[PDB]
Design an enzyme around this catalytic site. Structure first.
Site, PDB file in Angstrom:
ATOM      1  N   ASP A  21       0.828  -1.215   0.000  1.00 13.46           N
ATOM      2  CA  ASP A  21       0.000   0.000   0.000  1.00 13.46           C
ATOM      3  C   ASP A  21       0.872   1.280   0.000  1.00 13.46           C
ATOM      4  O   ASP A  21       1.635   1.461  -0.952  1.00 13.46           O
ATOM      5  CB  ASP A  21      -1.084  -0.045   1.100  1.00 13.46           C
ATOM      6  CG  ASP A  21      -2.084   1.088   1.048  1.00 13.46           C
ATOM      7  OD1 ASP A  21      -3.024   1.011   0.236  1.00 13.46           O
ATOM      8  OD2 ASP A  21      -1.913   2.062   1.810  1.00 13.46           O
ATOM      9  N   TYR A  56      -1.502  11.180   2.640  1.00 11.20           N
ATOM     10  CA  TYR A  56      -2.373  11.575   1.528  1.00 11.20           C
ATOM     11  C   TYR A  56      -2.291  13.079   1.251  1.00 11.20           C
ATOM     12  O   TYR A  56      -2.487  13.501   0.113  1.00 11.20           O
ATOM     13  CB  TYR A  56      -3.839  11.249   1.861  1.00 11.20           C
ATOM     14  CG  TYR A  56      -4.160   9.780   2.008  1.00 11.20           C
ATOM     15  CD1 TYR A  56      -4.590   9.031   0.917  1.00 11.20           C
ATOM     16  CD2 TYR A  56      -4.119   9.158   3.251  1.00 11.20           C
ATOM     17  CE1 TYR A  56      -4.925   7.686   1.052  1.00 11.20           C
ATOM     18  CE2 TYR A  56      -4.444   7.812   3.398  1.00 11.20           C
ATOM     19  CZ  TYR A  56      -4.853   7.081   2.296  1.00 11.20           C
ATOM     20  OH  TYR A  56      -5.181   5.756   2.433  1.00 11.20           O
ATOM     21  N   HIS A 114      -7.463  -6.544  -0.794  1.00  9.26           N
ATOM     22  CA  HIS A 114      -6.463  -5.495  -0.567  1.00  9.26           C
ATOM     23  C   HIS A 114      -5.407  -5.887   0.468  1.00  9.26           C
ATOM     24  O   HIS A 114      -4.226  -5.589   0.281  1.00  9.26           O
ATOM     25  CB  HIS A 114      -7.120  -4.162  -0.174  1.00  9.26           C
ATOM     26  CG  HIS A 114      -6.126  -3.059   0.016  1.00  9.26           C
ATOM     27  ND1 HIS A 114      -5.572  -2.399  -1.063  1.00  9.26           N
ATOM     28  CD2 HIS A 114      -5.565  -2.586   1.153  1.00  9.26           C
ATOM     29  CE1 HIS A 114      -4.720  -1.528  -0.552  1.00  9.26           C
ATOM     30  NE2 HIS A 114      -4.673  -1.612   0.777  1.00  9.26           N
TER      31      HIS A 114
HETATM   32  C1  LIG Z   1       0.295   4.112  -2.569  1.00  9.76           C
HETATM   33  O1  LIG Z   1      -1.064   4.493  -2.601  1.00  9.76           O
HETATM   34  C2  LIG Z   1      -1.779   3.993  -1.492  1.00  9.76           C
HETATM   35  C3  LIG Z   1      -3.221   4.338  -1.705  1.00  9.76           C
HETATM   36  N1  LIG Z   1      -4.106   3.276  -1.242  1.00  9.76           N
HETATM   37  C4  LIG Z   1      -5.021   3.452  -0.270  1.00  9.76           C
HETATM   38  O2  LIG Z   1      -5.219   4.537   0.269  1.00  9.76           O
HETATM   39  N2  LIG Z   1      -5.698   2.307   0.060  1.00  9.76           N
HETATM   40  C5  LIG Z   1      -6.518   2.074   1.191  1.00  9.76           C
HETATM   41  C6  LIG Z   1      -6.355   0.855   1.838  1.00  9.76           C
HETATM   42  C7  LIG Z   1      -7.150   0.538   2.924  1.00  9.76           C
HETATM   43  C8  LIG Z   1      -8.077   1.444   3.409  1.00  9.76           C
HETATM   44  C9  LIG Z   1      -8.231   2.650   2.754  1.00  9.76           C
HETATM   45 CL1  LIG Z   1      -9.411   3.787   3.341  1.00  9.76          CL
HETATM   46  C10 LIG Z   1      -7.473   2.981   1.645  1.00  9.76           C
END
Ligand SMILES: COCCNC(=O)Nc1cccc(Cl)c1
Length: 314
Positions: A102, A233, A291
């Site tokens: 991730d 983010y 995921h």
């Molecule tokens: C490298 O980019 C990563 C973005 N991915 C990302 O945010 N994924 C995500 C995984 C689990 C829960 C939530 Cl809310 C989001």
């Protein structure tokens, strides 16, 4: 945690990084995602140690026992990668194989790009390597694909923190689920005003996670909350400017791309045409996997990594 070794490294005067250590041999650095911990690699830690590797399952900046400054700027890829280099300098390591999932996957790709002399080999679970376009804005790219609608809700500081910190038990019970059990809609956010809408007040326990495991993530996130993990983010403008500075330079150390078939957020289709920038890029596709790659199919992850490390990282 009681049957595990806990390490601490002061990478900056106010920033301390926590990690768990097991085994002997070449250094294998594990970088988790969001909203995870070192505990996400619980099946990988003893498996890689038995294969003959010094495992370093990290607690990323803003997570668990590691320092969590409230500053957004402190979570941009430039400072994060530099902190991971300082971590190697302070532990007396010249090289280490960086394996990310991730957000940790994004970090390991940048580490192989800017600091190849410190990265022996690179592996990424779900996260693809996409070279940034200097003509297209980062906000335009997020708005283009409807699946990344949740990211806009994660931008305003404090908004997502209040929902995610509200009921930590409800938070991880709704998130840590298999794709067939998935009760979340990522393209529905910023229209409903929250990540948990379809999920009830008391969600059912997933088959891949126990009550003891869920409570561990609750206690670890009770220390700092969600401000730190969400700031990863909030640096989309800063990370793009840093990625545009590399434009031209390619990776040259052995690489591995691991895709999860049933992952709806980081689709295996996103990793298409990655063999144009390559460099060595070997693949590992896990069928009927959501995921949470490490939680969903732990055995298939161990088999893919051990096979890859012994043939390209050693
Ligand atoms: C490298 O980019 C990563 C973005 N991915 C990302 O945010 N994924 C995500 C995984 C689990 C829960 C939530 Cl809310 C989001």
């Amino acid at each position: 945690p009681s049957d595990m070794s806990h390490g601490y490294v002061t990478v900056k005067p106010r920033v301390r990084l926590h990690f768990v250590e097991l085994g002997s041999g070449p250094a294998v650095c594990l970088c988790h995602g969001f909203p995870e911990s070192w505990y996400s690699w619980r099946y990988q830690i003893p498996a890689l140690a038995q294969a003959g590797y010094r495992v370093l399952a990290m607690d990323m900046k803003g997570y668990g026992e590691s320092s969590a400054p409230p500053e957004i700027e402190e979570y941009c890829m430039e400072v994060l990668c530099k902190e991971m280099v300082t971590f190697l300098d302070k532990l007396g390591l010249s090289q280490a194989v960086f394996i990310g999932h991730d957000w940790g996957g994004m970090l390991v790709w940048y580490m192989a790009l800017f600091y190849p002399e410190r990265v022996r080999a690179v592996a990424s679970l779900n996260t693809p390597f996409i070279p940034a376009n200097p003509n297209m804005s980062p906000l335009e790219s997020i708005k283009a694909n409807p699946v990344f609608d949740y990211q806009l809700y994660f931008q305003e500081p404090g908004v997502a923190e209040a929902e995610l910190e509200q009921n930590l038990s409800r938070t991880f019970k709704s998130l840590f689920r298999a794709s067939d059990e998935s009760v979340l809609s990522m393209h529905k956010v910023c229209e409903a005003g929250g990540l948990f809408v379809n999920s009830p007040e008391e969600p059912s326990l997933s088959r891949m996670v126990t009550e003891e495991e869920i409570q561990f993530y609750v206690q670890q996130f009770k220390k700092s909350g969600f401000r730190g993990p969400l700031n990863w983010y909030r640096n989309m403008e800063r990370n793009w400017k840093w990625a545009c500075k590399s434009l031209g330079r390619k990776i040259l150390i052995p690489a591995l791309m691991v895709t999860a078939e049933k992952d709806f957020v980081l689709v295996p289709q996103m990793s298409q045409h990655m063999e144009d920038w390559i460099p060595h890029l070997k693949r590992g596709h896990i069928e009927d996997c959501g995921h949470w790659t490490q939680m969903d199919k732990p055995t298939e992850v161990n088999q893919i990594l051990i096979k890859w490390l012994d043939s390209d990282a050693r």
